[PDB]
Structure formats: C-alpha cells, structure tokens
Scaffold this active site. Structure first.
Site, PDB file in Angstrom:
ATOM      1  N   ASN B  10      67.825  -5.259 -22.257  1.00 28.46           N
ATOM      2  CA  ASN B  10      68.762  -4.396 -21.778  1.00 28.46           C
ATOM      3  C   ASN B  10      68.232  -3.319 -20.590  1.00 28.46           C
ATOM      4  OD1 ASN B  10      71.142  -2.525 -21.036  1.00 28.46           O
ATOM      5  ND2 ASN B  10      72.063  -4.139 -22.347  1.00 28.46           N
ATOM      6  N   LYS B  12      69.761  -1.364 -18.205  1.00 28.64           N
ATOM      7  CA  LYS B  12      70.782  -0.223 -18.046  1.00 28.64           C
ATOM      8  C   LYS B  12      70.781  -0.398 -16.438  1.00 28.64           C
ATOM      9  CE  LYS B  12      68.974   1.084 -22.122  1.00 28.64           C
ATOM     10  NZ  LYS B  12      69.206   1.910 -23.375  1.00 28.64           N
ATOM     11  N   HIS B  94      77.928  -1.746 -26.882  1.00 21.73           N
ATOM     12  CA  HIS B  94      76.738  -1.117 -26.925  1.00 21.73           C
ATOM     13  C   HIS B  94      76.856   0.535 -27.230  1.00 21.73           C
ATOM     14  CE1 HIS B  94      72.714   0.431 -25.895  1.00 21.73           C
ATOM     15  NE2 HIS B  94      72.085  -1.078 -26.132  1.00 21.73           N
ATOM     16  N   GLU B  96      75.440   3.304 -25.883  1.00 23.56           N
ATOM     17  CA  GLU B  96      75.544   3.908 -24.817  1.00 23.56           C
ATOM     18  C   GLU B  96      77.098   3.900 -24.424  1.00 23.56           C
ATOM     19  OE1 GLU B  96      72.710   3.112 -21.798  1.00 23.56           O
ATOM     20  OE2 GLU B  96      71.252   3.048 -23.550  1.00 23.56           O
ATOM     21  N   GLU B 164      72.030  -0.804 -33.841  1.00 23.88           N
ATOM     22  CA  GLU B 164      71.683   0.402 -33.162  1.00 23.88           C
ATOM     23  C   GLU B 164      71.480   1.677 -34.100  1.00 23.88           C
ATOM     24  OE1 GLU B 164      72.932   0.730 -29.035  1.00 23.88           O
ATOM     25  OE2 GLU B 164      74.766  -0.129 -29.834  1.00 23.88           O
ATOM     26  N   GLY B 170      68.096  11.654 -28.936  1.00 21.86           N
ATOM     27  CA  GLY B 170      67.835  12.849 -28.799  1.00 21.86           C
ATOM     28  C   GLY B 170      67.964  13.860 -30.262  1.00 21.86           C
ATOM     29  N   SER B 210      63.849   0.950 -29.961  1.00 21.31           N
ATOM     30  CA  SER B 210      62.700   1.519 -29.202  1.00 21.31           C
ATOM     31  C   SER B 210      61.736  -0.030 -28.967  1.00 21.31           C
ATOM     32  CB  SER B 210      61.754   2.520 -30.167  1.00 21.31           C
ATOM     33  OG  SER B 210      61.038   3.312 -29.437  1.00 21.31           O
TER      34      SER B 210
END
EC number: 5.3.1.1
Lengths: 247, 247
Positions: B10, B12, B94, B96, B164, B170, B210
């Site tokens: 992926n 992005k 997804h 995001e 996921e 973060g 990751s």
C-alpha cells in the site's frame, strides 16, 4: 478585462477506455476553438491517458485534489502527481464532494492553497441547495465559501469561481438566465468588495448547472457570466456545441 | 497448502515516475517465490503506468473505489474502471480512510459487495484503535466489522481480510506479535462461527501493520498469520529483501 470565456468539461466517474478516447479524438478534430479556454478533467488514472491523447488547447484539470506533498492516506492523491504526469488544473469544493464525503470549507481552503503554492490552476466550486436558497441563505452559503476560498487563497492569476445552484440540479425546477445573472452578479460584488477591483475583475465566474445545446448560448448571452461547468451533457459532441456559445 | 503468503503493498501517496520505475525494475529483476502472492496498489493515475510496466507475475490493486460504477461522484474511481484498465485487486475501508476521512461499515460493505459483483478481488480493512483496544471492546468492534464485511461478501475466495493495529498510531507504542496473533485467531473464530468451517479455514487473514526485514521472518513464522498489508516497506527494495528474507 477579457474574462476569457471558460468551459469546464468534468468527466466524473463515467467513460470507459474506448468512449473516452472517442470523446477526446472528437474534441481534437473539433476545429471550433476561439478565444475560449477549454479545460478537461477525468478520473485520476484515465488522467494520464487524457493528457497524452489530448492536445494543449484543452487543458486537463482533475476533479478532487489533495493538500500536502506526500503522505499516508490510502486512496487520496497529491497534486504533485497529476503535475508530474501532465495535468495543469484541479477542481475542488464540488457540491458532490461537499455532500457525499463531508469535505469542509477548511479542506477546500487548504486544498486551494497547496495547489496554488505548487503551481496548479484552481477551480473553486461554491454552491447552494434548494432547501437553503429557500430559507434564503444563498447569500450566506456562497458568500461564506468564497470567503474560505479567498482566505486560504494567495492570488488568482490562476483562479476560477464556479457557481452551483443545486436547487435546480436533478431536483426538479427551472434555472434561468436570470437566477444566474442574479447570483453571479452578487458573488462578483462580494468578491470585488472583499478582495479588490483588479482581483474582482480578472477573476472569472462560471455557471455550474445543466448546460446544453441552446442553453449555453442562452446563458452566455448573459452579462456578468464568463463560463460554465458541464457534466451529463459534456459526454457528447455537446461539448463543442456548447463551448461554441457566444454573443 | 490451500493458502499462500499474501503480500500487499500500500503506497499511499508518495509516488513519483522515477521512483516507481526503479522500484519495479529492482523488484522484477529480483527473485520471488511462487508459494508467495505479491500485489501492490497506488494512486489511480499511476495504477496504469504500473500495470503497463511491472512484470506479468506481480498483482495489482486500487487503494480505493466508490460503491458505484458509472456515476456522478466527482473524484471517485470505480471498480469497473479498475477492471476496464485491467486491475484485479481493490482496497476498501482502510484505517487511514476510515479515521482521517469518514468511511463506515455499511459503506465498506456495500462497496465490497459491488466489487465482488464486478468480478474483482476484495481486500477489506478491519481496524482496532487505542480507545477500543483499551476498554477491551476491540473484540466487539473487530467482529462487528468482520460481519459487515462478511454479509456484504459471500465468495470468500476473491475475499481477503486485513487486520489493522492502530493503537499503534502516534501512540508511541508497538503492537506485540502476541497481540496480532490474538486478533487473528479471534477473527478466524468469529468467521468460523458466522459463515462455517470451510470458510474459517480457507479465508486469508493478513497483518496490516509495520513490517521490515528484522520483524519479517518472526512475524511470518507467527503461525496463524498469512502475510502483510505493508506501507512504507513497499516503496524500496526493503520489500524484496523481506519477500526473500521470509524463508
């Protein structure tokens, strides 16, 4: 001074390889040119094809642009992309984007800004929807959005304002030369007052509705109108037909 | 066995002509197994270059599509276009998307359905975030997500589930190979429960986190895991190092 007649051809999420190729070819042949700025925009991907098959004359602007250079956002895309490939414009703030994805004025703004900073032509879509026109918030709606746009802004020698009245988009009803003139005039004035004459002046304002063969003429035949945004219709030789509009 | 390592890249929005080409080439001149299945997805407008280019044996996907083929969805790409171009893999819901845009279960479902329909391979994102993970409701959420997926779905062969771990967003944190194993095993049971044994067994659950050379072997060995839905990694040779630093 000019306010160079502007036609926006937005392909949407329509057109198959074949058909699209067709359309473009046609447009090319289509002598009809004039003191007309014709900008074509198609799905990210088809984008490249568009660029490559098409010819200068027709600028290629993409519908929906993303703020930020590069990042972590599976799906979206950055203008740098269309840029490297061959697109020079970008339309954002489309009632559609507004309504379906929830984009925000804030978003439109950031978008606009990045695009400009990065040398991209911008097409700001501002709009009003039946319900609101009614309570009578055309004023508030449009005025605000334009605010957003300009605010985020940073000059216009590469900017167009497209006015959309949803009160007449597949919502039953008849949008006349008149309502257009009316709303257009007004935006213009808002524009002028808040930014300055030069800006007001050089910045172009186009009609965002059902623009067909007969309508085009009909509308442009209108004063403070410098262009239009065609969808449906745009799919056929209609484009040329329409583009041809004039006094 | 009936199940081979599933590696999905992926990208992005980091894409550049130069970059892509090199990556591809490297990848292509590289030695990849046949028990492993490799597929990568990037910007709509690069998806084509990709295909034109990449070695006939490498799989390709769109990190997005709208739940409709031909329509008025400014900025939306379609399952259909995907195929038309010749793409076979699509990515829906997804993290995001889901958290920095506003995409939901019903949505994701509807999409997956249409995608399955248009004879495309559906890649569905299921995600667990910090709050949820914390309360201990992660389970609840994951299962509900899985079901939505599930229901929209039905043809579980051209259907892939990706897990996921966000709570590793973060957060200054890191998802334990334990945690992921846990998630995967539980997801399988839920599927087992709802659809049937066959399903539960055949159905591919992949890790959407990751992933690098140094975690690769370990992870992969992990037992209950079929691969990776990788970000960063798939931009450079790290991916290949991985692909062959798997055994």
């Amino acid at each position: 001074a000019p306010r160079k007649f502007f036609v926006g051809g937005n392909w949407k999420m329509n057109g198959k390889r074949k058909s699209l190729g067709e359309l473009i070819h046609t447009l090319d042949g289509a002598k009809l040119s004039a003191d007309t700025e014709v900008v074509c925009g198609a799905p990210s991907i088809y984008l490249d094809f568009a660029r490559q098959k098409l010819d200068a004359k027709i600028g290629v602007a993409a519908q929906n642009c993303y703020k930020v250079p590069k990042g972590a956002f599976t799906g979206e895309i950055s203008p740098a992309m269309i840029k490297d490939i061959g697109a020079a414009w970008v339309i954002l703030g489309h009632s559609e984007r507004r309504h379906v994805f929830g984009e925000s004025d804030e978003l439109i703004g950031q978008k606009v800004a990045h695009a400009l900073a990065e040398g991209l032509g911008v097409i700001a879509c501002i709009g009003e929807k039946l319900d609101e026109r009614e309570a009578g918030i055309t004023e508030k709606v449009v005025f605000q959005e334009t605010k957003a746009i300009a605010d985020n802004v940073k000059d216009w020698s590469k900017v167009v304002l497209a006015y959309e009245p949803v009160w007449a988009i597949g919502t039953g009803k008849t949008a006349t030369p008149q309502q257009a003139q009316e709303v257009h005039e007004k935006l213009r004035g808002w524009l002028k007052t808040h930014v300055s004459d030069a800006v007001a002046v050089q910045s172009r304002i186009i009609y965002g509705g059902s623009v067909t063969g007969g309508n085009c003429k009909e509308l442009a035949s209108q004063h403070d109108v410098d262009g239009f945004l065609v969808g449906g219709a745009s799919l056929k030789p209609e484009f040329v037909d329409i583009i041809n509009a004039k006094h």
